[model samples]
Target: MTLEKFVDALPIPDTLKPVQQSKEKTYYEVTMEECTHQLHRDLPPTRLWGYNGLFPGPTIEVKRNENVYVKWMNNLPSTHFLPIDHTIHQHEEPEVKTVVHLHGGVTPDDSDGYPEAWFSKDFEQTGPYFKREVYHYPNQQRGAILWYHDHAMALTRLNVYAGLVGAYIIHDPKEKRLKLPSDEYDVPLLITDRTINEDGSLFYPSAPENPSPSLPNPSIVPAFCGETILVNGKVWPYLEVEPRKYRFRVINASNTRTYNLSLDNGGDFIQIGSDGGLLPRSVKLNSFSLAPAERYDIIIDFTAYEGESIILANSAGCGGDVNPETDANIMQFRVTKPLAQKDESRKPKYLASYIQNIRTLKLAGTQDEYGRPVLLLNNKRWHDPVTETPKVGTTEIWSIINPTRGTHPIHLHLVSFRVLDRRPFDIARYQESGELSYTGPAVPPPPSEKGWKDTIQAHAGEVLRIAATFGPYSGRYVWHCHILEHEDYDMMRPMDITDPH
Candidate 1:
């Protein structure tokens, strides 16, 4: 077979395993270590930073409303394994500093993973420390898949690129009773990309000043990747599957690339949930796109193509989303036997029940209006200082206006919000640079986004409005472009959500 027929199906990385948390709540200890790993013989083994010395660190699975405490230790030495830019928020300096952010969970403002709330080894050194690093998630949210990654300012890309990410799953036993894939039928796959030099070492930028002829400048911050692909830490891996329905919790850990996935066998995907938790019901789709930092809970039936091999691929770039041509075969799938005896319990209604509350009317008033008075809602760039500093226990509207012609996933460090709606901008303009800009149309928020969300994807030339409630945990937090490269330059900002009586 030609290279074209060389499918990209790699074995799935299993991140979640049953662990006995001996309390009413769960306590997790995370660490950052510098170690050497061999990837290619051309180069020497690369020294990298990891949580527990594991890339894409441990996956923490918990139940809804359960309190969780995490002790994150940074034991790595002063030597930096990844790129660092002193000009940016490089927390782990002469000391190994670290701060953890629960990407899509709703919690007290204090525990919401403040960028300045970082700490060094043995807790001897610390950042702002306005309050505490221990977070309290109310769990008043859906049972979606959220992730945790390093969020130190100016260095998020390098830190995460170096190896500092893990999965967090919140589930409701009542909901699981609906009969989705359980036990051996479920899997979580984390996908990322890297470049290996002639030596068996990982290659990334060493500093923010590393220049690339293809990039505008400051090539240390990349808009995309320079290396090849890896899944759950393996290259071109494969998975042996039994003919049955399997639920795959997919996380797009790529620095800046998007994946539009579908099966080459012409089988559609059953999307049951998104970024934070489960959808009320599953939706059938031919193909879907997952921006960086996004997650999808999906089910695929291997029995459909039994006895035949089917390739799982992403043909998105052909339609012009991102540079899809370079990332077509994200992973592959080979169908085999042990086919179930005419299973009938795997239909849509087999899913569990979910509860939702709409905040549409709450955003209609002036006090709760979500529109920002700027050219675009995301104008609050990193260098511009903080513009949105809300008081704890208060709910406010955030109008996300995108002035550029590209889509951006806006992520907040501490809390999640309910997407109110997307609408066409009521204005248009021409810049002094002689380019005409269009604000075009307004897009309404779909039902899925009505609940709390820590990240919102604002499409190009559109405005996204959301209604979000902040609790009494007062402290500072940072929000920025989920696009790692843009975040490095200055697409982020700090906000202090004060305590409101």
Candidate 2:
């Protein structure tokens, strides 16, 4: 597993251009294809299924309130390259399926990429919930770094790992007025973890050697921790930056790994926005935790450290401690590039800028009265009746309790919310008596999480309280754990937003 570090340059995915455009409406097309691309200089070109045959896909940018339509076509082979655990889907669905989800979208129900809304190549085969071929994004939300990825049922983890992910930026005129790094200076950093074979192919774990009687032989693993870390499709790559202020839309696109990212040179990262959008105020920190599907819009100023190379290091480990030589080091920042122009980007203190209690949801994985629903709010099956029915134009508080040993990054589809605070709770007592008693004082959410967020981390033995309002348009949506593995295996629930007359 030996590979050279910082030998490859980070790739910035090209911004997608619309096929048809007008003053108010825009149209674009994307096709999923199987392509071979080299991940590292030494490794041979690896086979990957991607958008428009490009690994990590193309970045799609749109102006706020601009009506955008994307015809996402699937042109890949009928068979999948990744190992399929028939047990997950009970061998009922097709081999290859995909549906694109605009993560952190304030979108309509039809375009939200419901797991059951999956479709096969060319729409030849479709799921029960399948609606249409072309997806529509209104881009009505504020300017923010949203992402689109594969969200098919059972195959989401494998599909995304095979490279069906891309960045979707909603540009707002108001944010542009602030003069924060624009054009080339503003970059998108999509980080992914993967275990590759020596021959240059992805290696995803299927099942354990010693399997339980209830579980099948090739069952899906509970979680996946990759051996290598890649940023923007290159393994342990480096980016050459000028001595100036730069804004990076950092997205944790990994499966189950949560990374605590930091600069080896002890440089400060001023976080300006989060999952939902820009924060009310910027928060400076040495490092921050990023779970799967979480987006941190941050500014890293390299003006003071010219001619110096800095490594973006990771402190959090997956399954074990961070291997300093491998997974620990994400990418490098070599501030050797000469300035192209004056660094006019301003790290403005204020960015875009809350609510109150509705339901007490517990993130449980137990089998007793506690885990009667299993992974998410209710049962594991997608066909299960929808219970999370929120009325439109209503604000409700969600106090999420996590008794599971692991941290589940919970994600809601339609509306972004405000995080109140998280306090320790007696897991054992709460699980037994169904009574919530705080074991520790409530700690307020930091500035980084003060903004709107669609995805949030609910740690073990803690109560993560958040407040959200049901929105502008209502039909149906979903809220679930962003860990692809858990999500596909039933950690997801249908969220039906009902509009009352």
Candidate 3:
């Protein structure tokens, strides 16, 4: 079906609500189950797995530094829904294993959703790192636009593609004081892509399809980029907005598809925050790029185009089998509502900063024995004795150099950091000379990146530097590529934090 017709048939995706709540602490319960939902108007109800039977799950709102606990119940079927590569990571062993990772949360090692910390329904079976049913999140870090999704060992990409995803907003009183489009005006846009079969079921590859000719290993998981664009579980949905400004927490939740987002009207907007939180100052830009799992909090003043229709478009050239013509269009914003009251929101110049020391690490890559590519952190594997050991209470600089061909959206599990700068380097010279040298001037990150960030895009042939503090409480955490397939295929490594004492 055509994009417009399908969108016109479906309802605008609504914001989700927390299932339960309390006073001092907030509690949430989610059950992983299989269900059928309409993804597009023209297509039949697509059968998929999701949290609490809702695709893209629900939005979890919590206060900054509050204690939050979640009971992730697994009620999925015994058999798998998507492709299962039995050769890699023994993922076929579990009948229904699931785990939840609060991406960008400064959680302890146990609650950090270790890849191996999966469990089945009724807690009948569990992975090696399985701790308990209730995951505790101290929420001790600064407020930011976070998310929760499946992080099972080798099944991340498959599970997340099966509609397992949600938004987690960490509210701050300081940020609230800004009065930047609160209540209905502040929206969370969870953007994802998927494929639908003619039978009204989700379509995912059963086997790995290598995009590179050099890689011949079917055992290695390939990137999964879909053909249809979905926003908050709806296909090409639209929203009616007032003439005032609106805050959009935009997250690229796709498994592999990266987006360079802009308005179809060719207008500029202000980016006030990123994956971490609010920026030091609002950045005005005509368009911005968002890799997989990256977030950008932008502000759009609909007053400029009142009584008009503005379509949010995508221009990012997602290579491979992805069709650019159909995937180019995102959601739309119809500015029809008149201003009810004076819009009093303002962007602050100072957001938040927490960095004490400096440290350096490089993202290196090589081909495995099967000729498939493998990514490493400072040239180390998952089991290669943890090397990124940071001292508690100390801030350090992490200089990540990505010389590989693909741009990796790197994610740091625990603390949010500030993007210092990113500069192109002489990849050939550095590889041969073993000397660190930059070929161009250092460029500051996008204006939206001035604040804290748990994830940043590390372009190939460039060195991305960030500064972050170590602890409030940390045993072991991780920093890895946000690409689920890449992460499951060995692009992940651990970060250990030692007590300062």
Candidate 4:
């Protein structure tokens, strides 16, 4: 699809299903099955696997401190529709094993959806850490914008690309008191990109290509970025909005594309919240960048541009070898309706409490003889002994060091943290001397990033510091790069939260 292709079209808002509530807890059953979906207005139905037959699944709403249980059933076929890289280790299994991970939920180990805990249809095939089908979520964290998606080992990219993702929001009475946009005024936008062939089928590289290719040996394939952008599962869709302030919870659901978002009409963005929850104070910005799997909650007032159209555009040069004219145009917002009601939402100065007890962890990036880069935490692989063991109810600091060329969006599964600062460092000097020397003063995070977050960008030759508390519910969790290719190729590691012995 091209830019302005759907400027006058209206996209229906996402709908939520009723939950099965009981006296003890709430239960929801989500089944993974194959279906055909129309990605664009002029395209054919593309084969996809999704939850409950919806492309982006359905919205899941819960309350803080509530207990939510979900039974994820895999009804997918034996063979995957997308290309499979047989060279990746442990990915040679034939059955279509699957597992569900609530991306930012503070879940227990059994329900954390460990990468290796996949299972196939009727439990015919299971991974090494496969548990029961039902997963429990202790909504112990603060209200935030979380998401649910497939986390199967070695195939997360393929699975999520096939349309297995959805929004999960945790509500709190305290937030309601602030009186933000409610009901139809608030929306969740899942922003992603895809590539399509002339025949209207999803395009994915299966064969090895020059400069970045995988051979017969177990080798890593480079990251994959798409050309066409999709918002809420539609290609270059448009939304008609009243000339009022609307709270948009934007999620960057792409596998590798990073978005530097801005308004075409030079409007300001009131960033009220981040992945973790509300920020201390709302920050105003003309533009902000989001890496894959990161979420940004902002409010855009359309009152100034009534009867006019504004584009939520992207200028970030990402998605290797894609045309900007087509890929940069994400979606359109036409302010057609008049002001319906008085906007009562206020950007509060006080949002949440700060974390404590800071600790620093170093990340290492290296290349093999083939010059293919690999990532590690404290110089350890996925099977290495656990090094990030934090005591329950204690806050720790993590100083993620990045020396590689590309920026990595590091994501912690069980809890969200606050970005303290990012400082440029002398990578070569530190690597040789085993000492730290800052090349520049620490730069405070952007106003949009000063709040709580679950995923953060660690740029090359810099040190990004974050603080997070361990407790809520502690067991096994993971922290990894949001770039799907890097995560699948050993950039992920386990973090165990244990009781203070």
Best by TM-score: 2
**What would the TM-scores of all predictions be?**
0.80, 0.96, 0.91, 0.92
Full-model lDDT for every candidate: 0.62, 0.87, 0.79, 0.81
lDDT tens digits, residues 1-501, model 3? 455522442233344555566667777788898999878777788888888888888788888988888888889987787867654554435656789999988788898888878887777889988888899998876677888999887788888999999888888887777778887788888999877777778878764554655444335555777777888888888787888888888888899889888898887878888887877777888999898888888888887788888888888766554244578888878888778888787655555453555667777767766556676677777777888888888889888888778798988888887789999988898888877888989999766776778878899899889888887776877778888878877778888888855
lDDT of 2 by residue, 1-501 (tens): 579999999999998888999998899999999999999999999999999998788999988999999999999999999888775554455689899999977788898888878888899888878988888899788778899999988889899999999999988887777788878989999999999899999999867444455655556766889999999999999999999999999999888899999999999999988888889988998999999999999899999999999999999979889989999999999999999998878998977643433787867663422112236554345667888888888889998888888899999998888899999989899878988888879999988888888899999999898988888789888888999888877788888889866
Candidate closer to the true structure by TM-score (higher is better), 1 or 3:
3
Model 2, backbone clash pairs (residues 3+ apart or across chains), number: 2
Q: After superposition, how far is residue 414 of candidate 4 from its true place, in Å?
A: 1.0
In candidate 4, the residue pairs with backbone N, CA or C atoms under 3 Å apart (3 or more residues apart, or in different chains) clash, namely 358-397, 359-397
Q: Which scores higher on TM-score, 2 or 3? A: 2
For model 4, residues 1-501, the per-residue Cα lDDT tens digits are: 343455435344455554577666988888998998788867778888888878788888888987889888988999888877564454556547689999888888899999889998867788989877889997888888898998988888889988899999999878887777777888898987888876678877664343544344434455777878888888888898898888888999888889888989999988888998888788787999989999988888887888988888888877454365787788889899767777676555556655555556676767654556666677778888988888888888888887777788999888887778999999898889877899999998876677778999999899998888886777878888888877876788888888755
> Where does candidate 4 have its weakest 10-residue lDDT segment?
207-216
C-alpha lDDT of candidate 1 relative to the true structure: 0.62
Off by over 4 Å in 2: 90-92, 354-357, 367-374, 378-380
Q: Could you tell which candidate, 1 or 2, scores higher by TM-score?
A: 2
Better of 2 and 3 by lDDT: 2
